[PDB]
A paper describes a structure:
The asymmetric unit contains one protein and one DNA chain; a dimer can be generated by rotating protein–DNA chains by the crystallographic two-fold axis. [name] forms a stable dimer by swapping the N-domains, while the C-domains are located apart of each other. In the crystal [name] forms a dimer in an ‘open’ configuration that approaches the DNA molecule from the minor groove side and makes no sequence specific contacts to DNA bases in the major groove; therefore we term this complex a pre-specific complex. Two residues of each [name] subunit interact with the symmetry related CC:GG half-sites of the recognition sequence. Additionally, K85 contacts the N3 atom of the outer adenine A5 of the same half-site. In the structure of the pre-specific complex these residues are disordered, however the position of the modeled backbone atoms corresponds to the R-(D/E)R residues of NgoMIV in the superimposed structures suggesting that in the specific complex they would make similar contacts to the recognition sequence. In the crystal structure, the [name] primary dimers form a linear chain of protein molecules via C-domain contacts. We hypothesize that in the crystal [name] primary dimer is an ‘open’ configuration because the crystal contacts at the C-domain interfere with the C-terminal domain closure and transition to the ‘closed’ form observed in EcoRII-C, Ecl18kI, PspGI and BsoBI DNA complexes.
To understand how different sequence specificities are achieved within the CCGG-family of restriction endonucleases, we have focused on structural and functional characterization of the [name] restriction endonuclease from the thermophilic bacterium Bacillus stearothermophilus W1718. [name] recognizes a hexanucleotide 5′-W/CCGGW-3 sequence that accommodates W (A and T) nucleotides outside the CCGG core but rejects S (G and C) nucleotides. The [name] protein is folded into two domains: the N-terminal helical domain composed of α helices H1-H3 (residues 1–69; termed N-domain) and the C-terminal catalytic domain (residues 70–272; termed C-domain). We show that in solution [name] protein exists in a dimer-tetramer-oligomer equilibrium, but in the presence of specific DNA forms a tetramer bound to two target sites.
Residue numbers in the entry:
A (entry chain A), B (entry chain A): 1 to 272
Write the structure that this text describes.
Amino acid sequence: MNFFEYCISTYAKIFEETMNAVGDERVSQKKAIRDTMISAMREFPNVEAAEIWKAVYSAHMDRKSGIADPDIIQKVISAENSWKKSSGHAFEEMIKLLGNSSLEEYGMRILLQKDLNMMIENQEIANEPRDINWLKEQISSNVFDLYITVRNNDKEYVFGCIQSKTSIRDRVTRDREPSMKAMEAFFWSVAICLDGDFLKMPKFIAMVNGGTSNYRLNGWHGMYVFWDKPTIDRIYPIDINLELFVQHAREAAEDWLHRRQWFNYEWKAGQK
Amino acid sequence: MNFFEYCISTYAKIFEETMNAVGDERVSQKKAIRDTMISAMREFPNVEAAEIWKAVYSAHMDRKSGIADPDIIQKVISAENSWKKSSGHAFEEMIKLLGNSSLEEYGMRILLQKDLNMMIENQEIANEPRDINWLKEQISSNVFDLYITVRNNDKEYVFGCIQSKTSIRDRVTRDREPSMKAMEAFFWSVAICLDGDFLKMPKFIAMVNGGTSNYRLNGWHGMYVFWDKPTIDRIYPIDINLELFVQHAREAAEDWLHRRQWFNYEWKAGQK
DNA sequence: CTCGACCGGTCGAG
DNA sequence: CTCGACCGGTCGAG
Ligand SMILES: [Ca+2]
Ligand SMILES: [Ca+2]
Ligand SMILES: [Ca+2]
Ligand SMILES: [Ca+2]
């Protein structure tokens, strides 16, 4: 028996024995991992411990997926990690392309974070230095996916910060705090969401709109969701035309330019 | 053609056309993702945008893995995420079990973070309140995987903080700063590593041992690696018996108990 | 090459 | 049920 065969067979034995006896899969698989690693390092002292750990991984992956072929596994993980890093960029780019075709006629455009970074470096952004510094900090910490600007007196101003998520699933507990900081800094702060399934839970409606003990204030000025459900306070429906986002951006730009002192969290579109 | 067939065929077409023309796979796959999402939302207005995005995912995963079967993909990801969350726990538990069989005869034991959390809550840890508070902060932020204690005058003291990683690959740029804070707090701060391949790079030797412009000070008191390479300053070899870790723990406990003021980053085992 | 950031099913303990 | 933390090949721009 070579070390790899030994690990495969030993992990399976210890898992099965432990699971029949204690009836807890998570405890049993950890025991199988730990005890197979220890046993194999004893039975095979001259094999690198990292290689043994990889054989244990193989055994655990086979049990939990039914797939023993390390090439299949590698290929799926490679593809998944490709999607994980590129798809969010593709979706931001999509929003920018869709939004800019509509916003252009009102003097506005959406920028990627790297667009805004280059424009700040080329001194193309007219905001006050205090804003520029704050935006540079948001860019540094990768807080917002997109930014939106408005042209006024031949100068371009960033007035809004945008989170654009392909899953509204979970990221929103950690996305709310920086959105509230953007509202505190007197920027329009909004989110664009692909899937509204998470808003099934009352918790997530409360995270956006506020008004409960856990979530006293709204977390955004507006949340734009790709669905056909009617508006719930600051949770608005959009489709490929981004209509309410574009019409609210018009109003936000106006108020940011002319009455910015009232652009804290209380600001809401369509109230005038 | 239903929307799913449309997405599969359209992603493939746009990718291939764009890749032959511009010769950049990452640009081309993002264009295929963006333009297939837009095209499909137009061709299929009554399909939920999230479902379209899932069909685009399917197409991208098929191109990059060769696997079209969504069940295979789901099963591999499920298994991978199981390994990702449980294997690190199994390895910590393994170190605790291995270490404690040896350390017991010298009045020492290794605790999991959750062990130390329970013992602090049950007032079983004799450290000064200043230490207790600091440890509670480290537990809160999940900084260390394991802790080590020593019994003195019938009281148990935490004297060391331990990082225990199954890949020394990357985590170490982010693990160094909290280890240096533990040394600043006058605890023994060490790391136990499964795979030393990353120490091929001079950068990572420097991260542990210090003495360069990028890394002026050592990042740990000691790094214990499962390999047979001879000691490089504070990078020590171990196998399943953890020998140098156990012998250095003896010395660390002694010095923490009796001359703790000199247990900053400069402390090193075996120098007396 | 370097190197920081990305994700989401699962784990774990409520 | 809730809910915060885990990872590592890839992306992206050096
Ligand atoms: Ca309100
Ligand atoms: Ca419509
Ligand atoms: Ca030194
Ligand atoms: Ca040995």
